[PDB]
Amino acid sequence: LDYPVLWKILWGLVLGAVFGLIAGHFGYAGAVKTYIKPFGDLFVRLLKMLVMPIVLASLVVGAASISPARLGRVGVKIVVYYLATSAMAVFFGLIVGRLFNVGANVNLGSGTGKAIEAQPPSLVQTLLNIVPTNPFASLAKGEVLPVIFFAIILGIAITYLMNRNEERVRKSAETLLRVFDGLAEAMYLIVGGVMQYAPIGVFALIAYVMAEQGVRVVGPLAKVVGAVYTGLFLQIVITYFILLKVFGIDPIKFIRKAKDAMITAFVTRSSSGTLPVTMRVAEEEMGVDKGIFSFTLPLGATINMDGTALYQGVTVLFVANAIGHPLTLGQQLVVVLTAVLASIGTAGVPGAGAIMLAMVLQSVGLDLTPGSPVALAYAMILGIDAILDMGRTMVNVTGDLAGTVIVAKTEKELDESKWISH
Amino acid sequence: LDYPVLWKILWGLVLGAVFGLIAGHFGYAGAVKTYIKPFGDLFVRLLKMLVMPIVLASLVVGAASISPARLGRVGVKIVVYYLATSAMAVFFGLIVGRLFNVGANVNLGSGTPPSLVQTLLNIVPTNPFASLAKGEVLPVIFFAIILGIAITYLMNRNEERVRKSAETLLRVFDGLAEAMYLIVGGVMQYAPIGVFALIAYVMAEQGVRVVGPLAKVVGAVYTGLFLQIVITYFILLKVFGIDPIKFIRKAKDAMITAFVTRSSSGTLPVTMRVAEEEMGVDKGIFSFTLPLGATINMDGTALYQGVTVLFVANAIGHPLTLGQQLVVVLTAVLASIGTAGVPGAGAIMLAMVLQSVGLDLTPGSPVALAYAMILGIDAILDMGRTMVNVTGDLAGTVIVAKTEKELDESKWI
Amino acid sequence: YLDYPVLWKILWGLVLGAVFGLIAGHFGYAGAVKTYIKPFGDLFVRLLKMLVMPIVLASLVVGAASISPARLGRVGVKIVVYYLATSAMAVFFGLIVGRLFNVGANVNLGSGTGKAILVQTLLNIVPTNPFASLAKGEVLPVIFFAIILGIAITYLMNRNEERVRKSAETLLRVFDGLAEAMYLIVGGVMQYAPIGVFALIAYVMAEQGVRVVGPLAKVVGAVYTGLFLQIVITYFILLKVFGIDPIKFIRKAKDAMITAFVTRSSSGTLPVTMRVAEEEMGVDKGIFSFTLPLGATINMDGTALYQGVTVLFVANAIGHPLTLGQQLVVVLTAVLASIGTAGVPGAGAIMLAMVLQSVGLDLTPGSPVALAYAMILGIDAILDMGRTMVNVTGDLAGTVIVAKTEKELDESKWIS
């Protein structure tokens, strides 16, 4: 029968979260899961549908445009960008976590230090596994990063065929490129259609996440949730804003534009499954060239270490203090750095944080055996994980946009007409 | 060689069925399975091959033509039709099982967490490429319709790059679809040999078993088809102004293929080519209605389940009135919607229905002994179950077609 | 401080790697070879694996769209006759070269059980889901679907309706564009090829080269003398008979041969074999896009050598007497049971194991025949290298011979 407002996706967030909270406090969280949540599963399923086609096609079309040496430059830039913001996330994660003093109370356990054969991640085979041995297979499996490799090789090769002298060579290559282009275009059209549904699906998703885990943010857990979020906020408001401003980009204009991707990132808790919304934003909103965002955006849905360095800095310090194990500021740095290195090869998927935490705890030598104190801390964190996941993913997508727009500004943004107010 | 002539497919059927019957009664069915059967396995393998490309390509081209408001309309029509014809199937199955009094004798036993969100939600594919790679027809149908609908909006868009890119893309799908129909055309030159091999086996293996009280079950289920086709499909066709006798003559290839092949979804290339090359239906209709009804069509299930639930009921002595027999069959029919046509489905579903009502299927108990009898004629039954579906799948595709763009009346006059 | 491209490097990367491998191996450093060197060659292998499915699908839709279904059937029957001809030669040489070297040198004793000793595979050529078969990496069904598509596209481009024709050309144009792209990229990888070839033989030599001392030297010795004879006698003589200069052939086949050798996969060398077939032998896409991937599957040459030698090494080590006749019957059986499989590393030991079972020999642990099998298995990589290399070479020789019989045709590629 409706609805007129176009500021709705943000309305659906707030109304949903408030509805979720109330439904949960009154014991009705069970009912949300049944009647409301599946609408958000639909929202989520549809976005999932577009991720392989949009990413594959947009990057064939984008590496075919621009050029391989310029493409190379955009890599070094988006990577230098991610080290910079990663150090800030690490630093803020340590600071924000100490301030709230998250290990408030109360149980005792048995200390340890780095133990059980102390190996950092393999990370050779992680690299060799970028090059897909069957492009068709990597498309059928969800694998983003090999598709990125094959899409870039296909694109660069396509362009080389179009400067070849023979006419058959040039007309065939172009028909091919034309097909990816038409495909990419259809995809972007569709996500716009999906986004018409988005505020209902955004509503259903925090309604559930709030009714389930919203009731749990009481007590000593409030402080970790409280800490992880002032940490996000600091990362955005200081390191992203200051970074945008230094490159001559208005920080407030950016957020009004990034908003759809941010809210979607948040509720969806998947970088890879927000990629369709993010990319359309990079194009229809930020005015970024496909030759840029088709590479940097899906690459950063994997490589961005910001939200893990944030999350990991807080929860390691929470476990450390609940179980009584003294952790100096330095050893926390070396732990978070290990988790961050260890996270790089894997893309953003919901649940990733608790999973990664379990790994750093084990490896550092703690016993995660049942009823143990340290198994009890992890289990507390694990119970607010969706709440934390939402902010982990959202801080990542935001910075994913923020670096895409900076690197773009550095060659062909170029479209400044996209930002003028009237 | 060389044999080529036409209209062999009806010949391969009758001749193979006779070869099979003769071969089975003298006990040589092992040799039929070894030496003859694989030739028919090949006919089935080739048709399976064309199903994903034919369905993907034909619907992207078909939904790119026409328009989404019209597309929605035919959806509603083909759904109303598949409901309507289902009622007739329920009714006839209920009656023929009673008339034949299929359950007869003699052994004794006693008797009397839903979802349907995740089923609907599972229509939307999370990886379109995986869904093409796995079988998954219903999600491909979804992605193909979105893709086509989207392609058309781009071809009406003002920008010049956009418009020619979209049309390039559409042409690739058109070219592919065009190639597929050529190939399925080719396989149909081979079809009567494979139709021959397939009933040759089905007659040689399970044919000798159709003696006795099981014949009454077969008699009842086949009286249901004939009654469904000849009464409710014919009457429905005449009601919308379509000649019932020309229809059968044309569906003939898809029907015989449906019958022998026992896969609704795997007769789909032949059905679609029949739907187009014979019935003269536009791609914009059958590229939706035919593969959708190869999943959603409930007719042959209400027939099969009506006869055998009543057969089990009477064999084990558990009384079910005409009314409570209906309520069981309605349940089995609802549970069938999310699933496409597959050669084991009848017995699998039968087993499930015995379960839910609480009957004990442990060996060697009567309800287990009753089901085990049905399971032994299942192929004879599966052949008629699918043949009636593809027949009705065509009939609604053409009826729904007649109401907008059938439109081609030159194909029959 | 490295240029490096002097561009005759792929044969250099091999010898320097092989020698580096031996030398590094004798000094016990193979552990470091496995870590620091090896992955550079795994990279080389991974890039080529990537290109196989598109290079093959695209090349054959375009190649079967060109030429014509009656001619294609002839090059089919011709390439099959070729592969039978060259196989009998491999069996013959495998029997002779193994006896000549007399591979059963030493020492242990055994009996075993005896003495004494399809359809669904063919049906499995026809893929029930082409999209699945592309993803699962199944060459023969992709080959089948590629030919039917190519043939149908050609018929559609002859159809009277203009739309049908313009669509079909679009479709065909997409595949040609793709194929052309692939060949471009494999051209690029070959720039990297000698570094990766160095790394691979470096590893294979550092690990298994050290084992080739003693009575295993003879089996490695006999198999390579078998390879040398197959190429230098039956490929050459067959090439001359059909009028092709044998020494020019080898210089051209060189990139594919070495890639084959080092990667030990007939099918994952396919991109390099197909590029050679095109940019070097001057063979038409309509010929080689069929014969080469088909021969990466059906070619029995390299198997008859491995099985002719190793069945006899097991035979003589285990003391079980085999007449020249009974050795023949085992190898023929092993070859028949072998066809459906594409080139994969480790394939040799795998097949040997089976013939041992079926003949009734007992492979129980600590057994004599079990002990013999293990020795062969320990030099298997060394044997694999020469096994697949001979196939890829002969794959080319039959591809250009059947090519010579219709449209090779490009004689301009070899002159002055």
Side-chain angles (χ1 to χ4, degrees), chain B residues 34 38 41-42 44-46 48-50 52-53 56 129 132-135 167-168 171-172 174-176 178-180 182-183, chain C residues 119-120 123-132 135 144-145 148-149 152-153 155-156 159 163-164 166-168 170-171 174:
Chain B
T34 300
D41 288 344
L42 192 38
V44 161
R45 224 164 202 271
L46 296 158
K48 267 169 185 171
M49 170 183 49
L50 308 174
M52 281 306 92
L56 176 69
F129 298 99
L132 275 177
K134 322 219 210 77
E167 204 218 321
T168 302
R171 223 156 45 222
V172 172
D174 183 47
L176 201 162
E178 212 68 17
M180 287 321 137
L182 221 186
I183 301 161
Chain C
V119 168
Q120 187 65 48
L123 276 169
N124 273 5
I125 290 182
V126 162
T128 56
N129 189 323
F131 298 106
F144 181 82
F145 186 86
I148 307 318
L149 194 64
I153 286 179
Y155 274 64
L156 289 194
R159 228 137 81 82
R163 176 200 60 85
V164 171
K166 196 247 302 172
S167 291
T170 303
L171 177 59
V174 175

Side-chain angles (χ1 to χ4, degrees), chain A residues 100-120:
Chain A
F100 273 76
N101 199 37
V102 272
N105 44 266
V106 53
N107 42 44
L108 197 153
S110 59
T112 312
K114 262 184 185 275
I116 198 47
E117 319 196 276
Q119 55 171 342

Side-chain angles (χ1 to χ4, degrees), chain A residues 282 286 288 395 405:
Chain A
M286 310 283 171
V288 179
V395 87
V405 161

Side-chain angles (χ1 to χ4, degrees), chain B residues 16-352:
Chain B
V18 161
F19 182 102
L21 252 288
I22 292 167
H25 181 261
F26 283 55
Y28 275 9
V32 175
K33 184 169 184 307
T34 300
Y35 297 129
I36 293 186
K37 167 109 187 310
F39 282 147
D41 288 344
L42 192 38
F43 173 50
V44 161
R45 224 164 202 271
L46 296 158
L47 292 186
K48 267 169 185 171
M49 170 183 49
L50 308 174
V51 178
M52 281 306 92
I54 259 288
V55 157
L56 176 69
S58 294
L59 189 45
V60 176
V61 163
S65 94
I66 79 159
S67 74
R70 190 127 83 89
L71 201 65
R73 177 171 328 116
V74 337
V76 174
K77 288 182 181 162
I78 208 55
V79 156
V80 170
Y81 168 86
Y82 278 134
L83 298 187
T85 54
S86 296
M88 292 311 303
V90 168
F91 170 83
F92 274 108
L94 235 43
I95 293 219
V96 286
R98 297 307 198 142
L99 283 189
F100 274 79
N101 196 36
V102 276
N105 24 264
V106 51
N107 35 41
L108 194 271
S110 289
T112 306
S115 69
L116 183 266
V117 165
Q118 188 62 45
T119 292
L120 293 176
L121 277 171
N122 269 4
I123 292 181
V124 165
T126 62
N127 187 323
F129 298 99
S131 239
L132 275 177
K134 322 219 210 77
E136 246 126 340
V137 154
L138 214 80
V140 160
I141 283 184
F142 183 92
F143 183 83
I145 289 177
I146 298 317
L147 192 61
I149 285 182
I151 283 179
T152 265
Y153 276 65
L154 282 359
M155 286 184 309
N156 294 344
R157 177 103 75 82
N158 290 344
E159 306 145 353
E160 230 291 301
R161 173 199 59 86
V162 168
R163 191 174 44 246
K164 60 148 207 56
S165 290
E167 204 218 321
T168 302
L169 177 63
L170 179 53
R171 223 156 45 222
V172 172
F173 286 113
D174 183 47
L176 201 162
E178 212 68 17
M180 287 321 137
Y181 283 101
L182 221 186
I183 301 161
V184 58
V187 160
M188 286 319 272
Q189 201 49 43
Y190 178 64
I193 270 179
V195 154
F196 176 101
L198 287 181
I199 22 67
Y201 185 75
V202 178
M203 285 314 188
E205 204 210 44
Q206 300 191 4
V208 313
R209 307 173 174 177
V210 200
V211 305
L214 276 187
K216 290 238 202 188
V217 184
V218 170
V221 65
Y222 272 52
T223 298
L225 315 172
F226 181 98
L227 260 44
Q228 182 76 344
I229 298 180
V230 145
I231 293 194
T232 123
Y233 290 161
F234 278 17
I235 276 177
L236 225 35
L237 283 173
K238 151 77 166 70
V239 155
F240 277 76
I242 307 119
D243 175 79
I245 304 313
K246 274 141 199 63
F247 175 87
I248 294 301
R249 185 181 199 95
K250 298 187 170 297
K252 154 197 118 279
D253 266 39
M255 299 193 313
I256 299 170
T257 291
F259 188 84
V260 122
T261 237
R262 278 170 284 137
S263 179
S264 206
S265 89
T267 296
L268 226 33
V270 172
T271 315
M272 277 165 85
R273 176 162 199 268
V274 160
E276 189 186 358
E277 260 328 304
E278 225 79 46
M279 265 94 174
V281 179
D282 185 43
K283 194 158 286 167
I285 285 299
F286 69 73
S287 73
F288 180 45
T289 57
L290 280 188
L292 171 64
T295 77
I296 244 53
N297 196 18
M298 304 157 250
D299 291 24
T301 266
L303 233 50
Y304 185 115
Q305 235 53 211
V307 176
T308 58
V309 163
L310 191 266
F311 167 88
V312 156
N314 288 329
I316 72 171
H318 175 38
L320 47 49
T321 40
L322 199 160
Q324 50 190 198
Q325 175 184 355
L326 180 147
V327 76
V328 160
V329 171
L330 264 300
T331 279
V333 161
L334 219 74
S336 84
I337 291 181
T339 96
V342 40
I348 305 166
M349 175 51 71
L350 175 59
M352 281 182 42

Side-chain angles (χ1 to χ4, degrees), chain A residues 110-140:
Chain A
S110 59
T112 312
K114 262 184 185 275
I116 198 47
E117 319 196 276
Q119 55 171 342
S122 69
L123 190 108
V124 165
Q125 188 64 46
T126 298
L127 292 175
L128 277 172
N129 270 88
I130 297 181
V131 165
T133 57
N134 186 323
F136 298 100
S138 292
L139 275 174

Side-chain angles (χ1 to χ4, degrees), chain C residues 10 22 63 73 87 111 116 129 137 142 153 155 160 172 177 180 185 240 262-263 270 306 317 320 338 388:
Chain C
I10 203 171
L22 252 288
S87 297
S111 197
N129 189 323
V142 159
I153 286 179
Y155 274 64
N160 196 11
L172 180 54
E180 211 66 18
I185 303 160
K240 278 215 202 69
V262 143
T263 59
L270 224 32
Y306 189 115
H320 187 305
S338 82
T388 73

